[PDB]
């Protein structure tokens, strides 16, 4: 156990010649949205959702 992702934390960019680019980890997980009022700001030549990269059919 000797990496930087086995201990959750600082980010790691990725980038691909067939799929979209991702910004590292997120956070250990997503607690920040369970209480209300996280509007997820928008209107900035925005980036779409659900990450349609790999399917089954």
């Amino acid at each position: 156990m000797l990496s930087v992702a086995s201990r959750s934390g600082p980010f790691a960019p990725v980038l691909s010649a067939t799929s979209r680019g991702v910004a590292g980890a997120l956070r250990p997980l997503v607690q920040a949205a369970l209480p209300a009022t996280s509007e997820s700001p928008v209107l900035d030549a925005k980036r779409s959702f659900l990450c349609r990269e790999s399917l089954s059919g």
């Binding site: 600082p10 980010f11 960019p13 680019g21 910004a23 590292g24 956070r27």
Partner: peptide, 16 residues
């Protein structure tokens, strides 16, 4: 384009 996309969540900025 890449740097404007990666910076739409406010914790790539704070972690630099």
């Amino acid at each position: 384009i890449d740097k404007a996309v990666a910076f739409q969540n406010p914790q790539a900025q704070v972690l630099e």
